[PDB]
Amino acid sequence: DIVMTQSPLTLSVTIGQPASISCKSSQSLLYSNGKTYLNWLLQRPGQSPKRLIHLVSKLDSGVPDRITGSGSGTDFTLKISRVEAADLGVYYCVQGTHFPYTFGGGTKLEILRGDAAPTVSIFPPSSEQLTSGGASVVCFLNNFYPKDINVKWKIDGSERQNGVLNSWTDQDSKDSTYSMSSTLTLTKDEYERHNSYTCEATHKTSTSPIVKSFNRNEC
């Protein structure tokens, strides 16, 4: 089959700047009738893909002409002259000249923005969970940028690696920031044997780890 190589894998662009994505194929996409069947799609976060361009350079109805497509043979390029927040997502090239139709791996376009330090919240086990004999300590690190962040849990001064469950959200199409959740699950018994639970983060916006903690005790 035809192999479609897309580069780059991801691009971080500031709103207002131009962006271009490349797509290379293992075979010429020139069909015997002289038409080149190369398409570009955009899959918005949580949305089905949508075609932007067809026949290399022909824009689909309702697609903004900020988007341009070009190329021939085996090399194609999609160019966004002035990027906006709505352009956030993964872009793919699909060739229809050869059967079966094949897609490129995708290029994720991320909106570059001003650094943002995380807002951290730490939550002890709820009464209900403890009743079941389980205990989860949750930590929310909301709205930060860049996405790159390292979080570690510490109980009574020692790092706890087992029982940690992390989850990150995609880039928010409203503020261009990221958020992540970290949950540490222990048994009720061990939870009640320790005192301090610390959620520690390492982010670009601070020369020292960002801390949030609580001491469980009684009264």
Partner 1 sequence: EMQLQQSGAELLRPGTSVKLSCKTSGYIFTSYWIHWVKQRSGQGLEWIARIYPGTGSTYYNEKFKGKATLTADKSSSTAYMQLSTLKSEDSAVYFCTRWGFIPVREDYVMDYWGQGTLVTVSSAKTTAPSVYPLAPVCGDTTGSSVTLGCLVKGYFPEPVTLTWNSGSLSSGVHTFPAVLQSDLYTLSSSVTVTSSTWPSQSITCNVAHPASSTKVDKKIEP
Q: Is 1 helix (H, G, I), strand (E, B) or coil?
A: coil
Task: Mark out the alpha helices in the chain (DSSP H runs).
Answer: 127-131, 188-191
Nearest Cα to Cα of residue 40 among 57, 18, 25, 26: 57
Q: Centre a 10 Å sphere on the Cβ of residue 209 and count the other Cβ atoms it contains.
A: 13
What is the x/- site pattern for partner 1, positions 147-186, by CB under 8 A? ------------------xxxxx---------xxx-x---
Pick one of 22, 124, 147, 154: the residue that binds partner 1 (CB under 8 A).
124
Shortest spacing between CB 166 and partner 1, in angstroms: 7
**Residue placing its CB nearer to partner 1 in the complex, 82 or 168:** 168
CA 169/CA 177 separation, integer angstroms: 9
Report if residue 119 touches partner 1, rule: CB under 8 A.
yes
| Among residues 98, 113, 212, 216, the one that binds Zn ion under rule CB under 5 A | 98
Residue with the two structure tokens 């079966």: 100
Structure token pair of residue 206: 């601070």
Q: Which stretch binds Zn ion (CB under 5 A): 43-51, 117-125, 154-162, 173-181?
A: 154-162
| C-alpha dist (Å) from residue 10 to 22, 106, 146, 147 | 11, 8, 14, 13
Under the rule (CB under 8 A), what is the footprint of partner 1? 33, 35, 48-51, 54-55, 58, 60-62, 90, 92, 94, 96, 99-103, 105-106, 108, 119, 121-126, 128-129, 132, 136, 138-140, 142, 165-169, 179-181, 183, 212-214
